[PDB]
Design a protein around this nucleic acid. Structure first.
Ligand SMILES: [Mg+2]
Ligand SMILES: [Mg+2]
Ligand SMILES: [Mg+2]
Ligand SMILES: [Mg+2]
Ligand SMILES: [Mg+2]
Ligand SMILES: [Mg+2]
Ligand SMILES: [Mg+2]
Ligand SMILES: [Mg+2]
Ligand SMILES: [Mg+2]
Ligand SMILES: [Mg+2]
Ligand SMILES: [Mg+2]
Length: 218
RNA sequence: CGAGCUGGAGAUACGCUUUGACUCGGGGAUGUCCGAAUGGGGAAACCCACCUCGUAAGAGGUAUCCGCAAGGAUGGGAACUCAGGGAACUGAAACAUCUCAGUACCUGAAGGAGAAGAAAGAGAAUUCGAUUCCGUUAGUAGCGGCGAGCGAACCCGGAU
RNA sequence: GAAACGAUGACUGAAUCCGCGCGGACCACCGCGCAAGGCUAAAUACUCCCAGUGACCGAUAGCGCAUAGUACCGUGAGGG
RNA sequence: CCCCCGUGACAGGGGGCGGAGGACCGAACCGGUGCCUGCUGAAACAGUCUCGGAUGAGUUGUGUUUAGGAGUGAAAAGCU
RNA sequence: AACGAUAAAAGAAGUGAGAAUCUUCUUCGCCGUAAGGACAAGGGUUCCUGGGGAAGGGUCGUCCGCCCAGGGAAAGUCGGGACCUAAGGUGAGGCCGAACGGCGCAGCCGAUGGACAGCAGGUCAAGAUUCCUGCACCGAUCAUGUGGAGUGAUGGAGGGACGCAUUACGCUAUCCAAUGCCAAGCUAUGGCUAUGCUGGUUGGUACGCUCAAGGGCGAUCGGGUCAGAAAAUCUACCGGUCACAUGCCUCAGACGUAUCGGGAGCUUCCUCGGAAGCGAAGUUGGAAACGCGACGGUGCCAAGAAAAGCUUCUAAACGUUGAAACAUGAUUGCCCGUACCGCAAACCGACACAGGUGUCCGAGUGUCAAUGCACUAAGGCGCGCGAGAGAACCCUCGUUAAGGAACUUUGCAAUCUCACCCCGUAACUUCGGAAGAAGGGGUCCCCACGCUUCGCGUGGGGCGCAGUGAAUAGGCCCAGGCGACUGUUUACCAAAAUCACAGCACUCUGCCAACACGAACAGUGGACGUAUAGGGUGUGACGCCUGCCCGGUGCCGGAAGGUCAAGUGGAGCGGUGCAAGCUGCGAAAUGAAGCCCCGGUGAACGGCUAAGGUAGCGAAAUUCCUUGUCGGGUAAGUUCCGACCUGCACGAAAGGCGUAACGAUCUGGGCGCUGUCUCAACGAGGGACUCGGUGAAAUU
RNA sequence: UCGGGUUUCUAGAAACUUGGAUUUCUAACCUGAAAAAUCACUUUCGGGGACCGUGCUUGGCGGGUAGUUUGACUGGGGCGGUCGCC
């Protein structure tokens, strides 16, 4: 049904020319307003109304209704149901995703929608079904395993939502025929090999080759 | 001024003049609309509003920057002037230094001219005496892949 | 370059009175002048503009124009 | 999604029904394959016959944005 | 030479100095999803009327889109603006910048989107939802009366906000049929006399217990503060009570009544021809939208403007005796565009140019269907030199004896094929395809009968050489290379074996990310994305796969030691002076990133001494000798296929070997059928030749 | 804590110091949530914080770009040979 969002708009560059190569497809995707802080709410439950799939992301977002009679979208994690509910704030018991900080949080307690700076909403493991693993508590900072396979410090003043996401993992997704791309991306990359001395470093020759392996520009 | 005038254009018709026209000189009053343009909008000259006065018709104000305020300023001028920024072909019989050149052009500020100006100096006589210009000194002194080539100043005579 | 002085960007950063600057490395003696305040006629430049003059042209010359930046080309800047 | 059959693990196959698809043929439309014609042309790139795409990575309008060593480019140094 | 498309004319009459060409009439031909008609863009008066004939019009010209004067265009409701916002453009304060200047929230500007009140006809030579007529609707301001109480923000919320594909039912436009109905008269050539033939056969408004699909529907009390900044008698959320159906609300539209138009044609005059006035009928059945009922049904994923208008809630605020509202009249009604051309002699193309140009309407017959093909209505038009001749030669056509690819570089070219229906249909395979494989048969008319008819099937007869009897309308096959595939490219010599592609892999980036644009600790794109995400490179479905060498280059790491800048800092030497001092040069030490150096990585550069080619393929689009040798097909085969292998100079992601399917791809072969050829003939049309009119060019 | 210097009270003790590092803290500086979008402020504030970054200078890397260079003889040009002296 989708609802109460905004309108996006294709565009691949500013104050002039093409910056990030390619991309221009589209299909008028609107933007739904989310929430990655989940704090001015701290204290009330809400009925996960539904899990409306929404573009831009790839994370079956979830619809919530916090008692006040207000509305909000949430990165439906990995397992909430047709109307399961949830509260929020330190007085939160690490259940199916919650608006809880970090110290009060268990070890190796996979979560997500995590954060990088007190408030300033999420900013980590918010995609596909990325699972941020926790580890050691420290002074105030913690020890975490970001999807990357990295160990970064961060402190508890930075909320997070229980467990990982999923969106089933873009798996059986194979795209298919060129164009499933155009279904979004664009002019799928041009090989600087089949280009010209003129346009790219790899260019020239008379058959095929390599020599140096550099990127566009140098 | 003194007897024509009724714009080039010359064409028909009506007409104005010594009760002084016309032309000429010199101040006024009218002057829409656009354009710095400023009420607001805008594809220049077109659309649209508000306040104040007002019989209607109609009249004035409504940009911004400085400044209590009075008052000043935004734009425009052919070349000339000072500043900010600053090429290359070209020459070196090839080329990077150098040359062309601080030339071309851009930009800014102002004027009728500017800029520069009252020696913390020139310069060797214990001399001179603000700055600008011309003559000459001098193609010297000196700079220079010491190549190509570039090149002052005091002194002295004048403009003032 | 032995290279003074002026100049300014970054750093530092003195004296005020037998004080200070300079006189082309640097020191002495010698001499010259006094900075971190301002102002300033005149001669000099140019020529859109006016007058006068010319061993200047006199209509393929002279200004592009005996007038037109018009006609005409160009999306245009521009040319003409 | 509805039924039929089955039998060794088998899948499966059958009648219903539904309406998928850089699917099929073809006009518009969009291309431009081969031949001939044209070559001081009807035309500074075309005509006839012939041919490809045709719900798509489709075709197109208005508005607007991107530019010179720069843009743009399903990439020829192509177009600007 | 040419006179701008091979859509053809012909006569009569007229005008006039003068006519192949101007007007008129009557024949003819051409177009008819257009060569008809309506906007928009764009042009400007080309429009109309009266004149003209120099130049412009490829000849003429009495004519013109040309020359001249005059006229011609009319809106409260159509478009736009006085309303709205999108990309983008701007922009008080604010962020950056040698200058000029680049940014940038709000706000403002900005359609091609939203939003909003008129419909039927009439008519100047030339305009019409704009003028007239007929009735209507909209805001506004006013009065009259009803009402008798609130009204209700730059503010809240609701709402306006919308994708693609497919599709059920109702219908309207629109079209068709008929011994429906009205109108008019004639018919003869042999027949018919009317059951023939021709034309017309309704729109606006208003009322109607008529018919009616389809479409739209919760309400209300109360509660919870933590939500709408605030308030809220609204919204959001929570909970109790009655809602299958119905129940409502609503009608697309049909019918009837009435009224207003219009309506085949009819009457008189006509200054020569328009003008004026009159008026019949309105049937039954069938077809039928890409439009209307609408914000319908369903499925799908690649997930679908914003704002105001608008309903509602209140803060403020006014008054609660003359409100909000309703009705009835009264008054009001701004600016710009409104002619004509408009797929085209009136726009872009130097030209009255065979080109280009967005959207809408776009009839009938026949043909499964259609916006196709043939004819044709309406409507438009016969392309602005013309007339003879009937040679060569050239262009575009029709036929062709015997032969049938012998042509040739090659079957290039042109024939054959060609539609629907029934039968039938292989190798191979990713099981979907290959498949319209191949091959074969049928198709016309009539009568009867059976079927659901427009029509089809069963059967009997019929005519022709011939029955999609006209027009549209796949020739097929085997074998191989190259790329898997739809796609894309060299506007004006290359469409392909290019580019792209799904998929694979390397690699880098934790967020002010890498990366990129930029004068700029400005702004911004990546992304309102956060690692199953973003960049760069290379490889190119799927299949089995991906070998050996880190010496040299590049990268990541290690990281003792060697080397190395500025600077800190020290000996030391030296110049001048009487001295303090002032002063030239200065050195060991200490001082980074890298560089040396140690180690590693090949879907890194890359080689096959750092090492030597696993699988696989091999004379290959990479072979030189070479027409390799033998086998295949031919009578005969430099090329093609098969194998072998002595791989000049095959090789595993510049990927290797394969691969159903696909290809305006290239190579070889076969069947068919041909004028490609033996070898050309005849015939047509358009030039060429002749005469009259106008009259180039390169060149010299 | 490591560097040393200065001054005093006895190499130590004390103090004044002036440096490197580690760490730590934080008014500058930075940056994020809120009623008032970019910005200024109020503060919860939150966290970063002497780093980054901006300015001057140092040396490295730098076909990303720029300016350029790349001889002559030559029975044609390149390849080969050659170009001075006896
Ligand atoms: Mg003369
Ligand atoms: Mg002139
Ligand atoms: Mg066809
Ligand atoms: Mg903005
Ligand atoms: Mg003829
Ligand atoms: Mg004869
Ligand atoms: Mg075909
Ligand atoms: Mg291909
Ligand atoms: Mg293709
Ligand atoms: Mg270079
Ligand atoms: Mg060489």
């Amino acid at each position: 049904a989708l609802t109460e969002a905004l309108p996006k708009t294709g565009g691949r560059n500013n104050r002039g020319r093409i910056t990030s190569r390619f991309i221009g497809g589209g299909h008028k995707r609107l933007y739904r307003i989310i929430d990655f802080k989940r704090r001015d709410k701290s204290g009330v439950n809400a009925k996960v109304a539904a899990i409306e799939y929404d573009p831009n992301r790839s994370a079956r977002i979830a619809l919530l209704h916090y008692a006040d009679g207000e509305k909000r979208y949430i990165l439906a994690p990995e397992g909430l149901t047709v109307g399961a509910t949830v509260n929020a704030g330190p007085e939160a018991e690490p259940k199916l995703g919650n608006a809880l900080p970090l110290r009060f949080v268990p070890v190796g307690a996979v979560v997500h929608a995590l954060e990088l700076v007190p408030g300033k909403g999420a900013q980590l493991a918010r995609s596909a079904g990325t699972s941020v693993q926790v580890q050691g508590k420290e002074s105030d900072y913690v020890i975490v395993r970001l999807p990357s396979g990295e160990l970064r410090r961060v402190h508890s003043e930075c909320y997070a939502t229980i467990g990982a996401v999923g969106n089933a993992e873009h798996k059986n997704i194979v795209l298919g025929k060129a164009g499933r791309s155009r279904w979004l991306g664009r002019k799928p990359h041009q090989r600087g090999s089949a280009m010209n001395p003129v346009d790219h470093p790899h260019g020239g020759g008379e058959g095929r080759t390599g020599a140096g392996r550099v990127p566009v520009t140098p």
